[PDB]
Amino acid sequence: GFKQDIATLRGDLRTYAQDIFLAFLNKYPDEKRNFKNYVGKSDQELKSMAKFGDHTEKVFNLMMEVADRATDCVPLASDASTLVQMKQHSGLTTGNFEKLFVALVEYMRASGQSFDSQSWDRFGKNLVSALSSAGMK
């Protein structure tokens, strides 16, 4: 289930991070506006960009840590607040997290693997709720 999915994703975190994040940017093209120099790039051009690989892996590592400290797909309120208060990232919004998790769930459902896609959908809605409660716009 969910805990095993954290283990699967981490075992190839760079590749899963990139492919899920590309699914997200392709499903919601306006999301590239928030990232310097992503606009007008193909998937392969983005993969060439040092900060794309580095930043996307750091996004997914943080989401795997929050996921790992969650109970029944409910993250720690204290993790939501540390996220809202992260240096730089003042412009983060819950809607863009709504969309990242929609993309993640559709990726898992299309995978040939026994990901607990319903648990990640729950976790997404619970992280969004928690970020909102913690004062994210």
Phi-psi region of 88 (alpha: psi -120 to 50; beta: other; left: phi over 0): left
For tokens 């940017």, the residue is 25
| Minimum CB distance to ligand BML, residue 59 (Å) | 6
Q: Tell me which of ligand FDE, ligand BML, none is bound by residue 51, counting a contact when its beta carbon lies within the kind-specific cut-off of 5 to 8 angstroms.
A: ligand FDE
Minimum CB separation of residue 112 from ligand FDE in Å reads: 27
Q: Name the residue among 88, 58, 82 with its Cα closest to residue 135.
A: 82
x-or-dash string of contact with ligand FDE, 62-91, rule CB under 6 A: x-------------------------xx--
CA gap 86, 41 in Å, rounded: 28
Which SS3 state, helix, strand or coil, does residue 74 take?
A: strand
Minimum separation from the CB atom of position 81 to ligand BML (A): 16
Do the Cβ atoms of 69 and 119 come closer than 8 Å?
Answer: no
Region from 18-26, 40-48, 51-59, 124-132 binding ligand FDE, contact rule CB under 6 A: 51-59
User: Binding ligand FDE by CB under 6 A: which of 11, 36, 71, 72?
Assistant: 36
Query: Residue 34 or 78: which CB sits closer to ligand BML?
Result: 34
Inter-CA distances, 83 with 20, 25, 55, 95, Å: 20, 21, 15, 15
| Minimum CB distance to ligand FDE smaller for 34 or for 85 | 34
- In the complex, the residues that contact ligand BML under the rule CB under 6 A are 31, 34, 59, 92-93, 96-97, 100
